[PDB]
């Protein structure tokens, strides 16, 4: 009953960079998949709740990254030749042994950041570079671990809309909730 389980992967990464650059004030298709001849897709249903948790989880992870240490690309240099290596070091960092939730969302907004500063540094070709590294790592290492136990339905069950704040408030039961009456 397949249909877009592997193609949807490249759809989540491409949609994350489309809204990322759109935030500042730059286009994405301008230097990404510019080659015409597309597939159009049926409509995209997994990105509904999935992309949703990726937008609130990407803005909360970024706010906590600078609010807890500093910027990401600000520390990187970015350039067509040693850029994939930079994202390669941050990738191994997160992977402590296998694939635990949380590092996947931080990796989504992380690559999107390198794409923003990339265009600002006259690195259009660099943007497309991170686009293939994001859809590849997602369809390579995160592929055999997501389909294993619903990696998108689960990623949304723990990082749903405002799930980060819901883990400290929605807790209630084992948290402490004083209303047993």
């Amino acid at each position: 009953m397949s249909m877009a389980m592997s193609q949807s992967n490249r759809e989540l990464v491409v949609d994350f960079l489309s809204y990322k650059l759109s935030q500042k004030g730059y286009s994405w298709s301008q230097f990404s998949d510019v080659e015409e001849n597309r597939t159009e897709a049926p409509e995209g249903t997994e990105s509904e709740a999935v992309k949703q948790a990726l937008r609130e989880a990407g803005d909360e992870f970024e706010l906590r990254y600078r609010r807890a240490f500093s910027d990401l690309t600000s520390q990187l240099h970015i350039t067509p030749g040693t850029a994939y290596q930079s994202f390669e070091q941050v990738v191994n960092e997160l992977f402590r042994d296998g694939v635990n939730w949380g590092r996947i969302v931080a990796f989504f907004s992380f690559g999107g950041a390198l794409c923003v500063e990339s265009v600002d540094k006259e690195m259009q070709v660099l943007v497309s570079r991170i686009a293939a590294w994001m859809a590849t790592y997602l369809n390579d290492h995160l592929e055999p671990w997501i389909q294993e136990n619903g990696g998108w339905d689960t990623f949304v069950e723990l990082y749903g809309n405002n799930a980060a704040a819901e883990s400290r408030k929605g807790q209630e039961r084992l948290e402490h909730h004083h209303h047993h009456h």
Partner: peptide, 16 residues
């Protein structure tokens, strides 16, 4: 490289 080592730290404060 400093990134990555801290990207996981925030994970705790925001883990599920």
């Amino acid at each position: 490289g400093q990134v990555g080592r801290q990207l996981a730290i925030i994970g705790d404060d925001i883990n599920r």
